[PDB]
Amino acid sequence: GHMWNLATSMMKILRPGRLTGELPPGAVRIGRANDNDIVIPEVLASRHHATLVPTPGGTEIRDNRSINGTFVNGARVDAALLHDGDVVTIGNIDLVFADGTLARREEN
Numbered sequence: 521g522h523m524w525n526l527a528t529s530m531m532k533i534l535r536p537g538r539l540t541g542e543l544p545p546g547a548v549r550i551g552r553a554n555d556n557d558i559v560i561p562e563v564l565a566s567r568h569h570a571t572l573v574p575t576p577g578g579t580e581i582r583d584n585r586s587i588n589g590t591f592v593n594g595a596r597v598d599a600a601l602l603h604d605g606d607v608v609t610i611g612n613i614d615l616v617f618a619d620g621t622l623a624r625r626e627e628n
Contacts, residue, residue, distance in 0.1 A: 548572040548620065550610060558622050562611035564588055569610060572620065577601070579620060581608065 539545055549556035550570040560569070570583045570590050578601045583590035585598045591609040592600050602608075608615040608622070615622045 544620075546574060548622065550622065560611050560613055560615075562613060564611040565613075572602075572622070574620070575601075578603065581617075 544557060548558050548571075549568060550558060550560065550565075550572065551568045552559060552562065552565045553567050556568070566584060566588070568584070569588075570581060573580050573582065580599055581590070581592065581597075581602050582599045583597060585596065588611070589596050591597070592602070593607055602617045604618050606617045607625075608617060614625050616625050
């Protein structure tokens with residue numbers, strides 16, 4: 521179109537993605553890399569494999585079910601609502617869901 525005489529800026533200033541302390545960001549990414557907060561030490565785990573996000577009605581687990589798959593309580597799912605004490609199988613590892621946090625089962 522025609523030239524307009526309003527000046528532009530070379531850059532925009534925005535909040536950087538710097539998270540600090542022992543505070544989680546409010547969502548958990550499941551995968552193989554240590555950016556994700558919770559990491560499964562598996563060959564069979566993708567770098568981003570599945571996501572945990574909060575919802576107004578609970579917490580969803582949302583899965584890249586396509587190649588290896590995710591099971592919740594023995595059932596293979598694309599997305600599901602989790603509550604505390606649900607058992608999730610990713611990478612042949614049985615994960616235990618408690619209050620937004622996943623842990624491996626171990627007979628301590």
